[PDB]
């Protein structure tokens, strides 16, 4: 498995969703399975997906150990750095686990 911080970017408007994962590939697969079931945690990402389906690109921002202290700090760094709340799909600061 490969862990760390990642971004899910809408290729139509460049807006992003910043998250953390124990394993990138599996976390991304879970995001889209959730969006298809219509019960994703982010109403903003869900709305975009309902309108466009999977027009997103997933990429790694930082590969780092999946440890709470490190993950929350780095996830929040990227959320702010990429302004993913005001201009993205994140609905709040980072969570872990």
Swiss-Prot record:
Residues 1-88 form the GIY-YIG domain. This endonuclease is specific to the thymidylate synthase (td) gene splice junction and is involved in intron homing. To endonucleases of group I introns of fungi and phage. This is Intron-associated endonuclease 1. It comes from Enterobacteria phage T4 (Bacteriophage T4). The gene is ITEVIR.
């Amino acid at each position: 498995m490969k862990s760390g911080i990642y971004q899910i970017k809408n290729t139509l408007n460049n807006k992003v969703y910043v998250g953390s994962a124990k394993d990138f590939e599996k976390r991304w697969k879970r995001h889209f399975k959730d969006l298809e079931k219509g019960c994703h945690s982010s109403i903003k990402l869900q709305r975009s997906f309902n309108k466009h389906g999977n027009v997103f690109e997933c990429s790694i921002l930082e590969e780092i150990p999946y440890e709470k202290d490190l993950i929350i700090e780095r996830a929040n760094f990227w959320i702010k750095e990429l302004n993913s709340k005001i201009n993205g799909y994140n609905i709040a600061d980072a969570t872990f686990g």
